[PDB]
């Protein structure tokens, strides 16, 4: 089973002179997008991003939608507010971001509820592990701190995080579980490429896998080639699966001395493979 999470990623970007700020909320269950609200529409509504969510009635969508629109205008005001804290021109683009959510264990109990904010890509403030007190990241954030004490909102948020947030996480898990648990094994293979003089490049490819977490290693007879092995960041195929590779430069004629090891959560056992000159 493992632990589970319900997380909302929220962005508000000012664009003075170009219209209203762009506002975006993305809901994630277990790091997989399931709801999205985009302000860039004539009738912007909360919408489903995973098939299993179409299970929810029009009541749920209106309610979520309504919360989002009110969050958007609240952030619109926050944009102007921060222009004051920092003494910034009213003419430049600024960004507020929020991550808000709960992680629960296999038991179903709170593992860590939380809520951090960011201004212009930098930590602003954040509810601590203890859902009681705030960590302001700078002088301006110190203001928001009081305003959220004198107004009492760090308990209000605790209720949400330990209650409705957890209850709905369960609810979502129950409906999406079969789709969430989806696993795709990587298909691996090795490719061979030239290189100045008497060296060649061996590239080990892992394709079509999910989740994205994965590990590619190269071995010279049972030692892992730690240093100068080249590897790209895991990347979207664009179809729901991921691709990765890892490559090493080896002596010409010594290709059969190297082994690529592919470790992935969905394989019976790690893949082991070598260059295959056809």
């Amino acid at each position: 089973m493992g632990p589970h999470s319900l997380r909302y990623f929220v962005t508000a970007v000012s664009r003075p002179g170009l219209g209203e700020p762009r506002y975006m909320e993305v809901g994630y269950v277990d790091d997989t997008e399931f709801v999205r609200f985009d302000s860039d529409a004539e009738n912007p509504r909360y919408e489903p991003r995973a098939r299993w969510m179409e299970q929810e009635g029009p009541e749920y969508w209106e309610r979520e939608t309504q919360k989002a629109k009110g969050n958007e205008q609240s952030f619109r005001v926050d944009l102007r507010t921060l222009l004051g804290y920092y003494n910034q021109s009213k003419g430049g683009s600024h960004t507020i971001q929020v991550i808000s959510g709960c992680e629960v264990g296999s038991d179903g109990r709170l593992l860590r509820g939380y809520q951090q904010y960011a201004y212009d890509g930098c930590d602003y403030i954040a509810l601590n592990e203890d859902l009681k007190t705030w960590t302001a990241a700078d002088m301006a954030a110190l203001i928001t701190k009081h305003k959220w004490e004198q107004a009492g909102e760090a308990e209000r948020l605790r209720a949400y995080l330990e209650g409705t947030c957890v209850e709905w996480l369960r609810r979502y898990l129950k409906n999406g579980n079969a789709t969430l648990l989806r696993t795709d094994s990587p298909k691996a293979h090795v490719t061979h490429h030239s290189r100045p003089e008497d060296k060649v490049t061996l590239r080990c490819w892992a394709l079509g896998f999910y989740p994205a977490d994965i590990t590619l290693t190269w071995q010279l007879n049972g030692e892992e080639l730690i240093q100068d092995m080249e590897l790209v960041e895991t990347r979207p195929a664009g179809d729901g699966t991921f691709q990765k590779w890892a490559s090493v430069v080896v002596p010409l004629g010594k290709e059969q001395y190297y082994t690529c090891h592919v470790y992935h959560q969905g394989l019976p056992e790690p893949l082991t493979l070598r260059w295959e000159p056809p």
């Binding site: 809901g27 979520e64 005001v77 507010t81 808000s100 305003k147 948020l157 409705t164």
Partner: peptide, 8 residues
């Protein structure tokens, strides 16, 4: 579901 964010 989602929560309401406090005015900053």
């Amino acid at each position: 579901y989602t929560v309401k964010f406090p005015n900053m």
